């Protein structure tokens, strides 16, 4: 967004449940979770790392057909002030962390 426009954001990582929903819809509610929070400044980009927290040492990439809840958990990106004239935008992107590791090549039939 424009240099005069200012904003504050927070991102939070919600561990898999066992969650009756939820998910929290306000920053005050998401504050309890593994989160981080940043305001816009001279340094635009912010890099939030999402931890691998799961009971099993590895977890499936594909989602199994019967599921009513996530097995790897949510992440959410709250704005935290609700007064913004006007617009602005936050580009988002993703890249593998230093320790990420895939295993077992497979060539699934699509579709």
């Amino acid at each position: 967004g424009p240099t005069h426009h200012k904003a504050k954001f927070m991102v939070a990582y919600i561990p898999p449940g066992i969650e009756t929903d939820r998910l929290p819809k306000t920053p005050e509610d998401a504050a309890h979770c593994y989160h981080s929070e940043w305001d816009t400044g001279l340094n635009s980009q912010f890099t939030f790392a999402v931890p691998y927290v799961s009971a099993s040492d590895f977890s499936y990439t594909h989602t199994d057909t019967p599921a009513m809840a996530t097995t790897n958990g949510w992440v959410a990106v709250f704005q935290v002030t609700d007064t913004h004239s006007a617009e602005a935008a936050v580009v988002v992107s993703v890249s593998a962390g230093p320790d990420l590791e895939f295993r077992f090549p497979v060539d699934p039939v699509r579709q």
Binding site: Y34, G41, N43, S44, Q45, T47, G97, P98, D99
Partner: peptide, 26 residues
Amino acid sequence: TTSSGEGADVVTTDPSTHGGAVTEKK
């Protein structure tokens, strides 16, 4: 871990920023 993104410099932060160690995998 704020850093200018316009320069397209590589950035890779482990969960160590939140106190969790992560060993490199081969």
